[PDB]
Write a protein that binds this ligand. Structure first.
Ligand code: HEM
Ligand code: HEM
Ligand code: DP9
Ligand code: DP9
Ligand code: H4B
Ligand code: H4B
Ligand code: ZN
Lengths: 407, 411
């Protein structure tokens, strides 16, 4: 019932009770753990809504109040009547901040309470959506001094009128498969980069072509839009010692903004809720630049450093890795763009975890994702036992639209 | 039921049916994952079924399932159990069981070597002195002058639980840790508690930074006894760097033989409480964890100062730069002195191949991602991108409580 988590570096033991409010399933069972797997009705609605309001009113110290009882009845009626309901703005904001609060895979949750919420529920078209998105991008970028934000489009009705942003992030580079068999640009986006062309986009076939937004409103077909170049802040990547680094011609955008997830609040579903914070260095330096299925630049950087790539035991890949990461952080800091290094980010998460354990009774956390992709054990999260479970409100994965859309 | 795992770097998908033979629990439920938690006398009633499953697995492995030799063995064990309440394994079954406990160890990245385990049968052992002799022979055989060979030595199994054989050391070879009155620690902080127990038992500690601890051996449930491993049998490696001539001046060295000695080996229901085993080191175990954990030798600062790195802000990644160099140093030293060792790229690449082979020939390969992925450079090794399934199969190696916590001293 009452589980404990120990930190093996400091011996600190914390007790977790919050998991007892868990509702969804983990993917695991008493016989098999799937901890490393990436993707493991009016009757159904009212209980969900009730759970939500109860936690909302409890949070505002008005649990079991008339206000609580009243709103509770109002939604009940509305659901029985409209088969659904609408959240007050206060509930919308609270639900959003909490879905972030509950994202077990996010290392930056110490910032959860400061989220700026943009209510875009009154949106009706793709141009509208485009307008809302440009505004989000500009507000969030804030000339390099990034601020967390989320823009929430209209909730689901009959699934046949869902709003969706086809991009996986508001800002991502294109990927083209060249005759060479090789891939130009970002391999992760190759497919999408084609679905844009299949819609009309005039790809510039470069190594870093900011993709175009493909916005879908009320279930209609998606439309393209080219984010104002002046609103997309990019950082040229240069090393603070290796002048040849700049010749690699690498650059990355300053705004990470997941746009393909689904936000669930009180049973209600929001299929279009792009959100953004700021990068942790490693996301770019390790994964985007060094994953083999991505820009895979380790060999190139290795060569330029004149390292002995003959034997893996020379740890050349590891040395190159560190440098590629030193340059990203350096480049971002120099241009005054917000970015956090894995040491600082993990330290803050540990601090956040401790606050959460004593003020909320726990903090769902996915160790496989919280531990940085480099120098794992030299960060404090490596030594921290964590409990993973699903709390609502939450951010969930959802099928790509192009594999579900009835044109 | 079938379970698929995918490699997100190569898009390869594998199917797992082996998990169906999994009996033991994981610590997880449909409502919570405990994947990152370190630690989440039998009765005749529960023994024969356990013996039976094992024998069935054993006879299928040798292509004689259902044979007369198979049925006669089951009858013999059954009679023996009701007759004596327990049973003895044949040499063949012991060897098979030991190899399979390793093969089933989900936290081990070196399993590609599993079938090559040299098994030493020490079931005829009766005294601590005898235990010391078997262990010296194990160390010498396994070390092989630097060309390491996997080995395990198996002491008498548990009977009533009051006559256990235990090796109190957590590893046959380890450096002493000493708590100073000023609160600082000399040596390996990880071994301070055990070191105190040794001194209390009469060990004369030399109090240096790398003193090989003595063996504290418990036979037949009696009080443990101290023995010093002949120095000439302990292979050690001075750590130096291939380009930084000042590295050697750090005064670092490490033993060459890693030998877990505090785990319990379970085979067909039988419990072997003293079963020291050894293979060889993956570099990061020494370079990353033993040297750089804040709770161990903690040398990152000193190494960073010497390299004269910008330690003014973590964002310069000085800790990361120093870590890589320390790890290059460990691999270079071992290779130079011709002592077996493997780097994390090589070990993880071998594990992936081993894993695929297992899915294809065995129907699966229980693996703990949290432990398999190296403590540095995670995503540039193939295992980071590999989905894994973790479950418990027997025979197996299990944790057991430290003996000083449960021992009834006789004095
Ligand atoms: C303020 C700075 C923030 C930092 C430094 C941060 C950092 C991170 C990191 C490093 C990851 C892993 C990314 C990956 O490997 O793909 C992550 C994942 C995630 N974060 Fe945060 N984050 C921040 C803001 C946000 C915000 C504002 C939200 C939502 C409102 C959020 C929701 C999540 C979710 C749901 C995931 C997992 C997504 C997935 O499964 O792909 N994060 N974050
Ligand atoms: C041939 C060399 C081998 C290599 C390179 C190898 C590598 C490793 C490494 C790196 C770990 C993680 C250790 C840690 O982080 O504390 C591990 C764990 C483990 N290995 Fe192996 N191993 C080898 C041989 C063996 C043998 C011979 C056995 C058993 C017969 C074995 C049983 C285990 C067990 C049970 C664990 C987990 C121990 C624990 O939970 O503390 N390994 N191995
Ligand atoms: N720092 C982030 N990071 C999350 C988005 C960027 C991340 N580096 C990324 O590329 N995410 C993709 C690829 N892997 C995720 C998946 N589940 O497949 C989505 N978000 N934020 O709001 O501050
Ligand atoms: N390569 C190894 N490694 C395992 C032993 C060395 C390991 N670095 C170690 O010190 N293990 C201790 C500390 N942590 C484990 C635990 N569960 O607490 C035991 N063994 N082998 O047989 O080849
Ligand atoms: C297979 C494995 O689950 C996969 O590679 C995971 C591991 N941990 C991760 N952690 C983070 N933060 N992001 C990722 O994309 C992943 N990928
Ligand atoms: C808390 C967490 O489980 C713990 O620090 C684990 C993580 N992964 C590990 N992996 C290996 N190989 N060895 C360890 O000691 C650990 N420690
Ligand atoms: Zn699990």
């Amino acid at each position: 019932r009452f589980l404990k988590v120990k930190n093996w570096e400091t011996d600190v033991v914390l007790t977790d009770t919050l998991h007892l409010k868990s509702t969804l399933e983990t993917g695991c069972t008493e016989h098999i753990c799937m901890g490393s797997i990436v993707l493991p009705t009016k009757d159904q609605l009212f209980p969900l809504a009730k759970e939500f309001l109860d936690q909302y009113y409890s949070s505002i110290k008005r649990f079991g109040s008339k206000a609580h009882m009243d709103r509770l009845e109002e939604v009940n009626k509305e659901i029985e009547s409209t088969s659904t309901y609408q959240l007050k703005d206060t509930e919308l904001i609270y639900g959003a901040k909490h879905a972030w609060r509950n994202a077990s895979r996010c290392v930056g949750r110490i910032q959860w309470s400061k989220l700026q919420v943009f209510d875009a529920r009154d949106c009706t078209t793709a141009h509208g959506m485009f307008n809302y998105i440009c505004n989000h991008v500009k507000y969030a970028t804030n000339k390099g001094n990034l601020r967390s934000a989320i823009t929430i489009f209209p909730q689901r009705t009959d699934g046949k009128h869902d709003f969706r942003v086809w991009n996986s992030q508001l800002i991502r580079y294109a990927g083209y498969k060249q005759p060479d068999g090789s891939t130009l640009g970002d391999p992760a986006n190759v497919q999408f980069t084609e679905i844009c062309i299949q819609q009309g986009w005039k790809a510039p076939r470069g190594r870093f072509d900011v993709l175009p937004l493909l916005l879908q409103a009320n279930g209609n077909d998606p439309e393209l839009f080219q984010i104002p170049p002046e609103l997309v802040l990019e950082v040229p990547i240069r090393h603070p010692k290796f002048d040849w680094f700049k010749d690699l011609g690498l650059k990355w955008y300053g705004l990470p903004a997941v746009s393909n997830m689904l936000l669930e609040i009180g049973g209600l579903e929001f299929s279009a809720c792009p959100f953004s914070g700021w990068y942790m260095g490693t996301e770019i330096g390790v994964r985007n630049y060094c994953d083999n299925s991505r820009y895979n630049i380790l060999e190139e950087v290795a060569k330029k450093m004149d390292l002995d790539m003959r034997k893996t035991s020379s740890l050349w890949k590891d040395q190159a890795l560190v440098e590629i990461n030193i340059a990203v952080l350096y480049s971002f800091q120099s241009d005054k763009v917000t970015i956090v290094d894995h040491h600082s980010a993990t330290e803050s998460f540990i601090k956040h975890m401790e606050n959460e354990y004593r003020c909320r009774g726990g903090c769902p956390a996915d160790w496989v994702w919280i531990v940085p992709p480099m120098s794992g054990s030299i960060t404090p999260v490596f030594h921290q036992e964590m409990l993973n479970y699903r709390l609502t409100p939450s951010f969930e994965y959802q099928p790509d639209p192009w594999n579900t859309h009835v044109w």
